[PDB]
Amino acid sequence: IPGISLNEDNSHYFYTRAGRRLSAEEVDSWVDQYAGTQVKELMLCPNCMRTSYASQVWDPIWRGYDPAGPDDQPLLASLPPEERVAARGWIHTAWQLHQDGIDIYARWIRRCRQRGISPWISMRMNDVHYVNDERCFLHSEFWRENPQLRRVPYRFAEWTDRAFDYGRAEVREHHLKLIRELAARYDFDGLELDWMRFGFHFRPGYEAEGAEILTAFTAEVRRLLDDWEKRRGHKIHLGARIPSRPATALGLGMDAVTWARRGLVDMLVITPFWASAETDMPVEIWRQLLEGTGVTLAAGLEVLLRPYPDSPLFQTNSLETVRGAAASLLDRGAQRIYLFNYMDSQTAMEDLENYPTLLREIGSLETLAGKPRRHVLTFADTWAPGEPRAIPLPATCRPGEWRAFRLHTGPKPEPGEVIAALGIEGGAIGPETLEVRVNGELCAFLGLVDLSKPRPDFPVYGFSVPLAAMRRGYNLIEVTARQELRFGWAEFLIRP
Amino acid sequence: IPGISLNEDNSHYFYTRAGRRLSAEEVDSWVDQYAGTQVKELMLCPNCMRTSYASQVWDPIWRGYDPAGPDDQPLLASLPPEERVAARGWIHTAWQLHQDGIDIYARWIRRCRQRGISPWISMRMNDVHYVNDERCFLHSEFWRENPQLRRVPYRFAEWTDRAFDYGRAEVREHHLKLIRELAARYDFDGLELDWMRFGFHFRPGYEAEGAEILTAFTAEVRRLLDDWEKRRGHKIHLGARIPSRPATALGLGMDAVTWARRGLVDMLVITPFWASAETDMPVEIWRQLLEGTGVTLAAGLEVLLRPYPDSPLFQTNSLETVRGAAASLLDRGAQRIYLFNYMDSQTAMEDLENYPTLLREIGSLETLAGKPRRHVLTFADTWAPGEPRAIPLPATCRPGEWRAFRLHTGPKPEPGEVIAALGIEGGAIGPETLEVRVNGELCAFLGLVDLSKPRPDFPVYGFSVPLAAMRRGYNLIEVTARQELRFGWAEFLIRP
């Protein structure tokens, strides 16, 4: 009964369906796969710097496009030949839909409500994909013509260095033009402000002024949706995607607690940016912070599952690891699981055959109960400029030294098997090299565990945990090594 | 004004006054030094595992003590000869005060009340000094006799490994016995549960059971003090010391938000343990978390000022660095500055001559306004077991890489000088080796800055900050190096 909010990105459908002349029937059919699942909202994303629909106030993705032209034309010249094919798949599908009189978002909204699903629009507030390429097809001419409105003029080490400065009146007006249009054109149940594309909206050091600025921006959004409530004749919700930890959120100018108390938002999605799902987010603290605000707290997952920032592994969540994350987050008080990058092809879980099952399971403690789950230790990819970073992995244990990992495994395990599993980097160990404890209780060596994807490319050793040791919420692995070892990977596998 | 809470420890007064037969008059005069200052409460600590007064339910410090005996007597046998002198200083001074019919805490309370100070009692809930020495004079026989009631049977790597487990009913009953005595013996304005001595009260992994357990204990303490409120004829306060971040506090089984909303406490002191004052604590988040509960939030300082956990420096805070910390925390919303280990001698500030100045200044932004101050980058000493740790220093910058440090400098500087100062560990920089920006603005090279204590034992390079670049709250130092460099120190010096 918590249920699922599922984000469809601005590019995905247009990439994957490229080369088909799409009917209105086919466009409608995309919604159907979500019908009869635990999905309660579809977060339809229509924009990056450019819109995928035929905007009057912004550049559509197909501005500058020669439909009959060669791949090597001005709009695509700046890409290597192979990437032209994929960009043009997005540009042409988006364009051809418009040429055929099909507004893909109007059709998805309408179809959502026939299928009992609540349709939302989710705007990317500050997308910066490929800003290293000034001539790239998907940048707005507004962005190309106005380098003075970027965040960081004194260097370029990161894409976010060329993000728009929301400190500027010009930049806010530019984003509010898109919103006024989205509210006029589309009869959505709610508008999501997606600050998490890419999280960085202010000059470094100006984030406190920025906080006051984004609260006032949010209030205008609410004030405008209140008008459209009267025009549409039903309630319109306003939500936002913000960082996973309160301090990082306030440090990037997102004072969501003020938004919630002033009645500006009624949904908050705490989430990472992209590098990895966070299996561990302080939901319970957010729940105290939002007490009495009537706001729906949504725990955001991302498709990637990686143990540390610098890992060369780029594997996605499985059904078992989303069951793990979802079990934990609901256990902590998440009033929704929110999927970002869990689409029906290309950007999707590694085990796509289990997507129907995933959408019928991860929305409830009841539907996860007694099912194989994996609770994997990751990290938070987004920190406010100069904020010290807390990254568990990797972790060296010198001989006779103790190392601890806390992993959130949510509901107490049902009768069955519990493994603490630990991967060791380098090139290894005896069954008495580690001493492994969970909540103080000795764990028996099991040996090499053969993991399903996602899995590291180094040995993973399994440790059998006494059932009764496991608690509700966090559980503590404690480990001492007789030899110096680097841990690259930690998890609990629970098999009832 | 917010004002000052000042903690006098269980040991200090008896250590420093050893060797003099003390008169009631001299005992009383100790309170007078705190009269007419911004000090509002004295937090008078009367215990570790043993009491400094003549307790009838716990061991006084002098249990085992032969007044007439040689230093080499069974109570002090386990210490090296020259530490027996200091130990016996405390024990003898404490013991002699009882024999002269002087109750130091009854007199202090009384004298506080005459000099318009609010007198508190602060109990150490789980002190473990020197628990490596099971024969040590300051451990309770109850501790010595009950190894099975400790937190961690499976290893001894830290003193907190031999702390009492409040998971056990006999451990809570043991501490409730002293509270029942302290409430009957002493007519205090409030009782402070000092959980931060040493902050670790539960078996590793049981900290969520712990949360329910400490809340139910705190409630019992509140119900007890409600009885004494009726006998004493006036309101009795309950406060507590807890970790500096909300996740770490809940992670150590201290759910102070529950305590506050259920009206169990009316004061909370966010604080480090010992290793360094924290110049940066999320006061503003605690203020949101505590909204409507009627609790006073106090920001706790410690006397040490150290850049990172493993630094070999052990210098203390100065008047300038305490003004720095105090300006910041008060700006962030602290309703009190709390000092721990800032006493009149031995354990105190490096510049003791400035103690009367400090006690009339750091309680208000008004009295701090227009005075030199130093905002030094430190670190949180205390993390929940297996909680990922965020430590800013030391920081390596590779050639052509960017490193940022956010430092909280509180109120916008008045007209005058601002220096960003950066200390470099290991073996030779030029005036262009570093590019230093504050809030994006270029800072001019100044050269080697000769710092007042506290100061690192490596070169400190100063950068002149355009006055107008400084903002209220955090200020961001960005630096890129042309050579690989490790930073061991970072501060803002503001000179009005």
Numbering used by the authors:
A (entry chain B), B (entry chain A): 6 to 432, 434 to 502
Paste lines from the article.
Here we describe the 3-D structure and catalytic center of the defining member, EnvSia156, of this sialidase family. We show, through ligand complexes with products and sialidase inhibitors, that the 3-D structure and active center are indeed an unusual arrangement, with family-conserved histidine and aspartate residues defining the catalytic mechanism that acts with inversion of anomeric configuration; facets not previously observed in the canon of literature for sialidases. The catalytic domain (residues 6–376) comprises a complete (β/α)8-barrel fold while the C-terminal domain (residues 377–502) consists of an eight-stranded β-sandwich. Here we show that GH156 sialidases define a distinct paradigm for sialidase action with His and Asp acting as Brønsted acid and base, respectively, in an inverting mechanism that is unique amongst all exo-sialidases described to date.
To explore the 3-D structure and molecular determinants supporting the unique catalytic mechanism described by Chuzel et al. 26, the structure of EnvSia156 was determined on its own and in complex with N-acetylneuraminic acid (Neu5Ac), N-glycolylneuraminic acid (Neu5Gc), 2-keto-3-deoxy-d-glycero-d-galacto-nononic acid (KDN), and the inhibitor DANA. The absence of related 3-D structures dictated the need for a selenomethionine approach to phasing, so a selenomethionine derivative was crystallized and data collected at three different wavelengths (selenium peak, inflection, and high-energy remote). The resulting refined SeMet structure was subsequently used as the starting model for refinement of unliganded EnvSia156 and complexes with 20 mM Neu5Ac, Neu5Gc, DANA, KDN. Two copies of the protein were present in the asymmetric unit, each composed of two distinct domains. The two copies appear to be related by non-crystallographic symmetry resulting in a dimer, discussed below in light of the interface analysis and SEC-MALLS results. By coloring the structure according to homology, using the same color scheme as in the alignment, it is possible to identify a highly conserved pocket on the “N-terminal” face of the (β/α)8-barrel that sits at both ends of the continuous groove formed by the dimer. Considering its position and conservation, this site is a likely candidate to represent the EnvSia156 catalytic center. The identified conserved pocket indeed shows the presence of three 100% conserved arginines (Arg129, Arg 202, and Arg246), hinting at a sialoside-binding region, although one of them, Arg246, seems to be too buried to be able to interact with the carboxylate moiety of sialic acid. EnvSia156 also displays several highly conserved hydrophobic residues forming a pocket that could potentially accommodate the aglycone moiety of the sialoside substrates.
